[PDB]
Swiss-Prot record, chain A:
Subcellular compartments: Cell outer membrane
Phenotype reported upon loss of the gene: Insertion mutants are hypoinvasive in the HEp-2 cell assay.
Functional summary from the UniProt entry: Component of the type III secretion system (T3SS), also called injectisome, which is used to inject bacterial effector proteins into eukaryotic host cells. Forms a ring-shaped multimeric structure with an apparent central pore in the outer membrane.
Official protein name in the record: SPI-1 type 3 secretion system secretin
Organism: Salmonella typhimurium (strain LT2 / SGSC1412 / ATCC 700720)
Domain of life: Bacteria
Family as reported in the entry's similarity comment: Belongs to the bacterial secretin family. T3SS SctC subfamily.
Subunit structure: The core secretion machinery of the T3SS is composed of approximately 20 different proteins, including cytoplasmic components, a base, an export apparatus and a needle. This subunit is part of the base, which anchors the injectisome in the bacterial cell envelope. Forms a stable homooligomeric complex. The complex is composed of 15 subunits.
Swiss-Prot record, chain C:
Any one biological process term the GO annotation gives: protein transport
Keyword Transport: yes
Family indicated by similarity: To S.flexneri MxiI.
Name of the protein in question: Protein PrgJ
InterPro entries the record matches: T3SS_SctI-like (IPR047754)
Function per UniProt: Required for invasion of epithelial cells.
Protein keywords: Protein transport, Transport, Virulence
Domain of life: Bacteria
Source organism (scientific name): Salmonella typhimurium (strain LT2 / SGSC1412 / ATCC 700720)
Curated annotation (Swiss-Prot), chain F:
Consequence of gene disruption: The null mutant strain is non-invasive.
Effect upon mutating residue 52 to A: Exhibits constitutive secretion of substrates. Retains the ability to display SipD/SctA at the tip of the needle filament. Does not yield assembled filaments in vitro
GO cellular component: cell surface; extracellular region; type III protein secretion system complex
Effect of mutating residue 49 to D: Non-invasive phenotype
Source organism phylogeny: Bacteria, Pseudomonadati, Pseudomonadota, Gammaproteobacteria, Enterobacterales
Consequence of changing residue 69 to N: Cannot secrete the translocases SipB/SctE and SipC/SctB. Shows increased secretion of SptP. Retains the ability to assemble needle complexes, but is not able to invade cultured epithelial cells
InterPro entries: T3SS_needle-like, T3SS_needle-like_sf, T3SS_needle_YscF
Induction text: Negatively regulated by PhoP-PhoQ.
One GO-annotated biological process of the protein: protein secretion by the type III secretion system
Single GO molecular function: identical protein binding
Protein name, UniProt field: SPI-1 type 3 secretion system needle filament protein
Outcome (variant: residue 15 to A): Can only secrete early substrates such as InvJ/ScpT, PrgJ/SctI and PrgI/SctF. Can polymerize into filaments in vitro, but not in vivo. Cannot enter cultured epithelial cells
Effect of residue 69 to L: Shows a specific deficiency in the secretion of the translocase SipB/SctE. Retains the ability to assemble needle complexes, but is not able to invade cultured epithelial cells
Superkingdom of the source species: Bacteria
Curated annotation (Swiss-Prot), chain O:
GO biological process terms on file: protein transport
Reported function: Required for invasion of epithelial cells.
Name of the featured protein: Protein PrgJ
NCBIfam families assigned: PRK15325.1, T3SS_SctI
Keyword set, alphabetical order: Protein transport, Transport, Virulence
Disulfide bonds: none
Length: 51, 78, 89, 75, 59, 79, 75, 90, 75, 90, 60, 68, 77, 76, 94, 75, 90
């Protein structure tokens, strides 16, 4: 019983090693209150950039 | 924009250092082209074009200098 | 990471001379067999043969193995060397 | 794939879009070789690409030496 | 195995020796292959020397 | 007159083994450089760290090699 | 940090502020690329930056070589 | 120069048996040796010591002396037991 | 035959015609050294040939070293 | 692959005395040795095999195994003869 | 003696025009192969006769 | 190691000093010309030393190994 | 304080161009006051060119002896 | 009376029939009129060809000495 | 030669006849071995004195074999001789 | 004395005066670093020196290794 | 040429015992050796001697001669001892 338990546990672990967890999804999110672009303006002293 | 290096940053600092010269020169170009005999238009164009020339020359030499510093350091990794 | 240890391994009393041999022989043959196997599969794995922090470990393992087998061989030879001189003489 | 591949791929992922940016900007320039905006844009990209490739190769070179020098002492 | 991967990287390179992307990949593959072959040969030799030394000891 | 024996820190070294600062810092510096391969301030740093790591690793390997040759030569002296 | 890092940091400590000065002068110039007085200053500062980085790198390389040549003799 | 000691007086032979002088010699040698090995190992890890040309020139001498000392002792002991074998076995 | 000869010949078959593309583009240029389309054609062929030969030689060298290091351990 | 054949059925014999068990063990070893030596010699002179890393990695092992096997047979034979000589001298 | 003959042929062709890159490229290969062949042969000859000497020393 | 009973560092400081002067003004041609010489001599010194120390180790080892 | 041999090779140049190291800074301090004087420009062109050549030949010469010495020391093996 | 590394050097010296003198001749002519582009163009070719000749000769004799020394080492 | 093969019609062997004495059978062995060894040693020496032999890989590879074969031959003659006299000594002291 | 000093000396009695000439030319050049007539002579003498010292040292190395081999085969 | 001296008639009407011949040989060798080692070390320390080609070319010969001499004395001594062992050893 001890021998079997040890072998089976060890091998199962080595197998599950290769199982994949990193599955990327893609989200889509509309901006309702602003523009997506880098609006940009010219001031008396300093070129002003909105990231 | 998505990806930019240090040389790209050095370069961009001129493109934003001059706010609107990039358009002013094309604007004056066609104001003049409409009436190439107006002294006021000629004088207005001559200075904007000179400033555009110096802007591009000053921009390019700097990028080259930084490239040579970085290549000199990377040469010593071996 | 999958690891096991066998704990209740050995008896510390005085025991008959015949079995101290069997227990020493068996424990040693087991240790060397597993050591050798781990050495070879450290070389075959591409992620271990090319990392400078891993190679430094493999170097120590190889040297320790070399020394251990050299010493067990030397002492066993001198052991039977004693008996053969006392008996021949 | 070994460790050296990892070290190379760290540069490949460290620069996100440079390879395609270079390929693109070249084709814009080749469409109108005399526009100063396109010329200025291209010089910087190509310089960056040059330094990237050089640093990558010199690093892989150094690591190879450290490994071969260790492996020599197995004997 | 590594033998095939190196052989194929070579076949792709020889088609267009001037492509940086191919060159960078080949440098890496050939390097790892070189290290692997050396480490293997040295370990084999070490084990055989031990084996021989035991016989020389009881001989 | 004879030099002093010294005194032995028997326990300390074998369990002082643990993750070195030096490899950690080398990998961190590489990860910083790979984000912007053209910054001279980062290149200057990485040149130095990589160099030190090269020297350290060689010195260590050659030392392990020397200490184990002595033991192999002793055993081969008595057999 | 070892001894090479210290040698390296001697230059960085010997030049008090150049890393800052050079950046600042660059920003002043970029605003007005055509003022000769902004332009002449930047020429000098950038020139000195160049030499500083060159000397700093070559020195580290020399010390590395002296060390590796010693460590070859341990065995 | 940091910390040093020396043993000034050696005990009279008139009160010490023949095997005590051996135990006492052996112990002293075994300790000075373990202490030298440890010292070298520690020099190889301090990053200041392992990368300074001045300090490496010292480590190289220390390791050469350790090597010669142990080779000497291991040779003379083998000659010593070889004499006993020659007289008794013969 | 041998294996290094197969490695070396693999390049020769990879580039089908280059060894005599160079000789032909040279013979064309030598007739009218001042034609810019001919100059621009010759520059790339000669560059390609240069790289081809370098890569070919260095690879044979590396394989030689690996073999010599293995044969050293027959003893 | 090309032009290749294998012997399926070995000829067979009775084994009834220590004499025949000895001649059989001798003949079994002699042939294996000759075959191995020839094989190695050929692998050293086919130029596709002398110069390919994969084939050299194999020849190394074949040489080692040959050395070890012949050294074992030599040692155990000499030990057996020495045991006979010792008993009869005694 | 085929691989002995090939190298002496290659050498003559090269010596005829030492600057021809196609000839240089060929000779590099031929010389490298010959160089490996000789070493391998000598080392195995040695091993085979050290085994005989160790046998005789065992009964001697 | 002494033969029992037998009857019978400046270059390092000099290089350190020259380095400290140079680091303060890396663009001075006179400080550069001086440092080049000090560093070259120090380099040669360290190499000659370590080669000699190895040659003596290897002679002592060969002697012992001859009688061992 | 210990002079080696390379130090002596260098000092040969320094003690050769006895005064050029001062003359360059004095001619500069003349010129910077009145940059338009042809006499001063003509003078400074000369002294500057001389100082360039002198520093260049000095550094190359020290390097060659450094390379001979290393090549001998490598044979002590 | 000579060995086999002399046979290998002499295969180059008899292979490039005349170059050894042609160089000296070209130099004798150029020394007389350095500013002549036809002489300059000729000398560049001869001097380069001679440089390669000498390098290939010396590296080949080095390699054959490395093969021989390794075989002799096994006479032990 | 290389372009010729030369056999023997049928290998009859007069020297297979035992007819000579147990001592003539000894003198033959001694005389033949002494001549063979002196010839071999001389040949090996010449192959080294002569400069075109001692510097060509093809010739060196052959000399290596000559040296090893000489070594093995002499070592085996010595061994068997010792074993032989040792048998006589073992029996007569018994 | 010894044979290896005999070999070393066979060079120094070969180059009669070079050892002096080099230092003399150096003193002249140092007196007027900008004379092309002086420069041209110094380049030659310095080169001839560099070559003499390299050939000498490598030859002494080779004869040392021949003797160190024979004294081992004395055993 | 500096300070040359030679003994004459060394053995013409007096002969040393072997007991003394060995002792004089040992002493005359051991001191010459120790002085040569000091000379070498001093030629390495002096900054003016390790940086001049003329002085380095002299030091290479000194190191070569020292190494060859000590190797020859060691080999001959070992070989001569061996013969006395083969004489005395039963
Ligand atoms: C009867 C005595 C002859 C053999 C004496 C054995 C002495 C060696 C013990 C030793 O130090 O090695 C321990 C050695 C190491 O054990 P460890 O240090 O406790 O791990 O243990 C062994 O491997 C024992 C090997 C025994 C093999 C010899 C078998 C005896 C002859 C065949 C029986 C018939
Ligand atoms: C008396 C008994 C002699 C034992 C002979 C051992 C034979 C050795 C052998 O087979 O190799 C032969 C060996 C090779 O000959 P092969 O077998 O024909 O190849 O020939 C020899 O070298 C024999 C040398 C014999 C010298 C024996 C000494 C006799 C001295 C007595 C003088 C009395 C007056
Ligand atoms: C009966 C025994 C007769 C002799 C016993 C003494 C054994 C040592 C003989 C060693 C031979 C020396 C060969 C040196 C070769 C050479 O050229 O070097 C000269 C070399 C320099 O020659 P130079 O040109 O004259 O300066 O000088 C040496 O280094 C001599 C080495 C002296 C070492 C001798 C150590 C004595 C230990 C043995 C004492 C034990 C006595 C017990 C007696 C036997 C047991 C009953």
């Amino acid at each position: 019983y001890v021998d079997m338990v040890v072998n089976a546990a060890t091998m199962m672990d080595k197998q599950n090693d290769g199982i994949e967890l990193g599955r990327q999804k893609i989200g889509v999110m509309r901006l309702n209150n602003t523009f997506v672009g880098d609006r940009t303006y010219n001031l008396r002293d300093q070129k002003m950039v909105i990231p | 924009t998505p990806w930019s290096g240090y040389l790209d940053d050095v370069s961009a600092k001129f493109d934003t250092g001059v706010d609107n010269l990039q358009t002013q020169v094309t604007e004056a170009l066609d104001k003049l082209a409409a009436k190439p005999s107006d002294p006021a238009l000629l004088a207005a164009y001559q200075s904007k074009l000179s400033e555009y020339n110096l802007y591009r020359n000053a921009q390019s030499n700097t990028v080259k200098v930084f490239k040579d510093i970085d290549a000199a350091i990377i040469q010593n990794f071996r | 990471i999958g690891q096991a240890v066998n704990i209740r391994s050995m008896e510390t009393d005085i025991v008959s001379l015949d079995d101290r041999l069997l227990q020493a022989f068996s424990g040693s043959a087991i240790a060397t067999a597993v050591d050798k196997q781990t050495i070879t599969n450290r070389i075959e794995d591409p992620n271990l043969v090319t990392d400078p922090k891993e190679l430094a470990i493999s170097q120590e393992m190889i040297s320790d193995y070399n020394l251990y087998v050299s010493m067990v061989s030397t002492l066993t030879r001198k052991g039977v060397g004693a008996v053969e001189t006392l008996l021949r003489s």
